[PDB]
Design an enzyme around this catalytic site. Sequence first.
Site, PDB file in Angstrom:
ATOM      1  N   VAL A 179      -7.694   6.170 -22.013  1.00 27.78           N
ATOM      2  CA  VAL A 179      -8.169   5.908 -20.555  1.00 27.78           C
ATOM      3  C   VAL A 179      -9.008   4.366 -20.471  1.00 27.78           C
ATOM      4  CG1 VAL A 179     -10.731   7.114 -19.890  1.00 27.78           C
ATOM      5  CG2 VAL A 179      -9.120   8.664 -20.920  1.00 27.78           C
ATOM      6  N   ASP A 196     -11.199  21.169 -27.449  1.00 25.50           N
ATOM      7  CA  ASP A 196     -11.653  19.346 -27.509  1.00 25.50           C
ATOM      8  C   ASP A 196     -13.126  19.751 -27.509  1.00 25.50           C
ATOM      9  OD1 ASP A 196     -11.692  17.205 -29.203  1.00 25.50           O
ATOM     10  OD2 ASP A 196     -10.804  16.478 -27.465  1.00 25.50           O
TER      11      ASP A 196
HETATM   12  N1  LIG Z   1     -15.095  13.316 -21.270  1.00 24.25           N
HETATM   13  C1  LIG Z   1     -14.300  11.578 -21.429  1.00 24.25           C
HETATM   14  C2  LIG Z   1     -14.570  10.708 -22.616  1.00 24.25           C
HETATM   15  C3  LIG Z   1     -14.320   9.254 -21.771  1.00 24.25           C
HETATM   16  N2  LIG Z   1     -14.432   8.960 -20.040  1.00 24.25           N
HETATM   17  C4  LIG Z   1     -14.265   9.295 -19.466  1.00 24.25           C
HETATM   18  C5  LIG Z   1     -15.219   8.589 -18.205  1.00 24.25           C
HETATM   19  C6  LIG Z   1     -15.292   8.496 -17.415  1.00 24.25           C
HETATM   20  N3  LIG Z   1     -13.716   9.586 -16.192  1.00 24.25           N
HETATM   21  O1  LIG Z   1     -16.125   7.957 -16.150  1.00 24.25           O
HETATM   22  C7  LIG Z   1     -15.460   7.463 -19.506  1.00 24.25           C
HETATM   23  N4  LIG Z   1     -16.561   6.964 -19.257  1.00 24.25           N
HETATM   24  C8  LIG Z   1     -17.389   5.816 -19.790  1.00 24.25           C
HETATM   25  O2  LIG Z   1     -17.208   5.979 -21.204  1.00 24.25           O
HETATM   26  C9  LIG Z   1     -18.448   5.453 -19.126  1.00 24.25           C
HETATM   27  C10 LIG Z   1     -18.287   4.367 -19.677  1.00 24.25           C
HETATM   28  C11 LIG Z   1     -19.263   4.514 -20.385  1.00 24.25           C
HETATM   29  N5  LIG Z   1     -15.382   7.996 -20.736  1.00 24.25           N
HETATM   30  C12 LIG Z   1     -12.517  10.470 -21.901  1.00 24.25           C
HETATM   31  C13 LIG Z   1     -11.839  10.774 -22.715  1.00 24.25           C
HETATM   32  N6  LIG Z   1     -11.770   9.380 -23.873  1.00 24.25           N
HETATM   33  C14 LIG Z   1     -10.750   9.928 -24.886  1.00 24.25           C
HETATM   34  C15 LIG Z   1      -9.667  10.439 -24.894  1.00 24.25           C
HETATM   35  C16 LIG Z   1      -8.705   8.635 -24.239  1.00 24.25           C
HETATM   36  C17 LIG Z   1      -6.810   9.001 -23.989  1.00 24.25           C
HETATM   37  C18 LIG Z   1      -6.798  10.850 -24.762  1.00 24.25           C
HETATM   38  C19 LIG Z   1      -5.240  10.697 -24.358  1.00 24.25           C
HETATM   39  C20 LIG Z   1      -4.599  11.817 -24.689  1.00 24.25           C
HETATM   40  C21 LIG Z   1      -3.018  12.397 -24.703  1.00 24.25           C
HETATM   41  C22 LIG Z   1      -2.809  11.838 -23.127  1.00 24.25           C
HETATM   42  C23 LIG Z   1      -3.220  10.185 -22.415  1.00 24.25           C
HETATM   43  C24 LIG Z   1      -4.420   9.717 -23.149  1.00 24.25           C
HETATM   44  C25 LIG Z   1      -7.724  12.374 -24.857  1.00 24.25           C
HETATM   45  C26 LIG Z   1      -8.508  10.999 -24.851  1.00 24.25           C
HETATM   46  C27 LIG Z   1     -12.844   8.424 -23.888  1.00 24.25           C
HETATM   47  C28 LIG Z   1     -13.237   8.344 -22.756  1.00 24.25           C
HETATM   48  F1  LIG Z   1     -12.799   7.489 -22.136  1.00 24.25           F
END
Ligand SMILES: N#CC[C@]1(n2cc(C(N)=O)c(NC(=O)C3CC3)n2)CCN(Cc2ccc(C3=CCCCC3)cc2)C[C@H]1F
Lengths: 286, 281
Positions: free
Chosen positions: A25, A135
Site C-alpha cells: 500500500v 486479519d
Molecule cells: N488498514 C490499514 C493499514 C494500511 N494503511 C492504509 C492507509 C490508508 N488508506 O490511509 C494507511 N495510512 C497510513 O498508514 C497513514 C499515513 C499514516 N495505512 C493498509 C494496509 N497495509 C498493509 C498491507 C500492505 C499490502 C497488502 C497486500 C496484500 C495482498 C495484495 C497486495 C498488497 C496487504 C496489507 C498497511 C497500511 F498501509
Amino acid sequence: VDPTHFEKRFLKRIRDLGEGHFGKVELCRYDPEGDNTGEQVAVKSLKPESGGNHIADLKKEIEILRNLYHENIVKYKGICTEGIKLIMEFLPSGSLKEYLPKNKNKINLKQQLKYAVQICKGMDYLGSRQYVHRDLAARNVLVESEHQVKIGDFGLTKAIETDKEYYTVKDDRDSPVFWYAPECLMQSKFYIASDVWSFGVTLHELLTYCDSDSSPMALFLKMIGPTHGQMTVTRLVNTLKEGKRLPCPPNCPDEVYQLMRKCWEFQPSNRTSFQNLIEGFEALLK
Amino acid sequence: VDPTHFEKRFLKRIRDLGEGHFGKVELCRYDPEGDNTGEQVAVKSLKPHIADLKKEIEILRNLYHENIVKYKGICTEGIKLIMEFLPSGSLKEYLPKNKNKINLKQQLKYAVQICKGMDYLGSRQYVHRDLAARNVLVESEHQVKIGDFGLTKAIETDKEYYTVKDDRDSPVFWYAPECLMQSKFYIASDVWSFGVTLHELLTYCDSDSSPMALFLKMIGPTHGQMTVTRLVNTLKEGKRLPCPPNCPDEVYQLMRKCWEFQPSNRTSFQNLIEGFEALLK
Ligand SMILES: N#CC[C@]1(n2cc(C(N)=O)c(NC(=O)C3CC3)n2)CCN(Cc2ccc(C3=CCCCC3)cc2)C[C@H]1F
Ligand SMILES: N#CC[C@]1(n2cc(C(N)=O)c(NC(=O)C3CC3)n2)CCN(Cc2ccc(C3=CCCCC3)cc2)C[C@H]1F
C-alpha cells in the site's frame, strides 16, 4: 468519464504506507492538472513477483471492497489498470498502532469503548454479507478522526459458502498467529466466531494504546517457553488449551475484561457475538 | 598414564564428518609417535552447550553394548569427546551405495540391532530423542551401532517422560505426536522414531522418499510456522508414511505398531525384536 477510473499517467507515487503478502500500500497523489493540487489516495498493488494466484486474489479483494458501504469501512475510490491497482481513501492519521501511542491524553476509556463499538458494527456488517475477515488487528483499524475508526484492509477476506459455517485456508505462510483462534491454528478453519476471537485481541491492543512492549506477540512470547517458530505455534496452541489468556490491561475495568474474555472461549460456539459486544459496550457507555 | 586422556598436541585433524547443534564431529589421527601410524578417532567439539556436551560425555562413557558406538576418552584444556571411527559412516550414506549387497534379511538384522541398542538405552532410563538413519553407524556389512547421543536425556525414576524444552532444532518428521504437541519424551517416543528409521532403512535412505519429503507431499510445503501444526493434524486424521517399495506387509504392520497415536498403545522394543526374529526364521 468514469470517476472510479484512475489513469496511471496522473497517479504520482509519494511513499510506502505498508508492505505485506507480495504487495504494498502506497500514498500517491492523483494529479491530472499537474500542479500538486489533486487528492491524496492509498494505492494497493502486487510486486511484479506474483504466482500462486496472487492476482486473482487481489481482483477478488477489489470486488469485495467495491461493494462494501459502511461508515466504519474504508472507502473504495476506484482502480488503475495496466497489473491492476486498488485505489482507496487516504486516512492521514493511519492505524490505531500509529495514532494511539501519540494521543493517549485525548483518548480516554469512553473514546476507546466508542471505537470498540465502531469496529464491531463494521465487523458485524461484514459478517452479514457472508465474509470472514481473518486479519482483524489494530494495524488494520484506521483513524478517520478522534471520533471515528474504519477497518482499512481486506487482503485476507474470504466469502463463507452459503449453508457452510467456515472457510478452510490452504495459503498459510504469513498468518498473524498471535491474533488467531485455536481452530485457525490447529485446523486452518475460519468462522465468524474466529473474527470475534481476533476482535478480543484487537480490544486488548486498543486498551494498551498499541504499546509495543504490551503487544499480543510480546505478551504471548513472555508466556511461552524456549521454542523455534517451527515449534512456536504448537506451544501457543498448548498454552491456549491449558486456558492461559492475555492478562487484563492496566486501568482496564474488570467489566470490560469480562467482555474481552467472552471473545476467547476455546470453542467457536461458546464465544460472544458482535451484536452482543455492541450491547455490552453501549451499557457501559450509559 | 590414563588411556582415556587424549593430549591435544597429538590430535591431528584430517577432515570434518558432520556438523550439528553448534559444533562438529571431525576425523583425527591420535598420533603421539608423529609418524602417521596412530589410530583414527571421531572427535566431537563445540565452536568458540558446554555443560550439555559434558552430560553427553558422561552418558556415553557409561554405555557398553555391541550396538552402541564406543567411548574412547576426552581431550581437556573446553572439552572434546573422543569416539571410535566407523569408516562406513551412517546408513544415510552407506545404504544408497550398497543396495546390491544389502537384501531384506540384512535390513531386518540391522532393525534388530537398532532395537537391542535402543532397549539397552531404555533400561538405563534414557530417552534418545534423535533416532534417525543419519545417527546409525555401519560397523560392517553385518553390524550397526547407534552413533550419536547429543539430544539424550535421563527419565527420572517413577516418571514416564522428560519435558525438554530447549526445542528449536527438533527433527519434527521423526517425532511422536506428544513431542510435537506438549514437548514430552517417553521411551515410547523413541519407538515412534524407530518406526520412521525402519522406513528409511527399507527405502535404502533415498532422499526422494525421506520421511520429510513424504510428509511435505502429504501436508504441502505450507509455512514451517504452520508446518508442525499441519503435521500434528495429519497424524490426528490417522495418516502415516506408506509401505516402502518391495516391503512385505508383515514388516509394514510391525512398523505401523510404532505409530499408534497414544504412547501406551505403541509396541515395545522387545516385541519388535521378537517380531523380526520371527520373520528371519
Ligand atoms: N488498514 C490499514 C493499514 C494500511 N494503511 C492504509 C492507509 C490508508 N488508506 O490511509 C494507511 N495510512 C497510513 O498508514 C497513514 C499515513 C499514516 N495505512 C493498509 C494496509 N497495509 C498493509 C498491507 C500492505 C499490502 C497488502 C497486500 C496484500 C495482498 C495484495 C497486495 C498488497 C496487504 C496489507 C498497511 C497500511 F498501509
Ligand atoms: N552417528 C553419527 C553421525 C556422525 N558420525 C560419527 C562417525 C564415527 N564415529 O565414525 C561418523 N562417521 C562417518 O561419517 C564416516 C566417514 C563416513 N559419522 C556423528 C554425528 N554428526 C552430527 C553431529 C555433529 C555435531 C554435533 C554437536 C553437537 C553439540 C556438541 C558439539 C557438536 C552433533 C551431531 C554427524 C556424523 F559426524
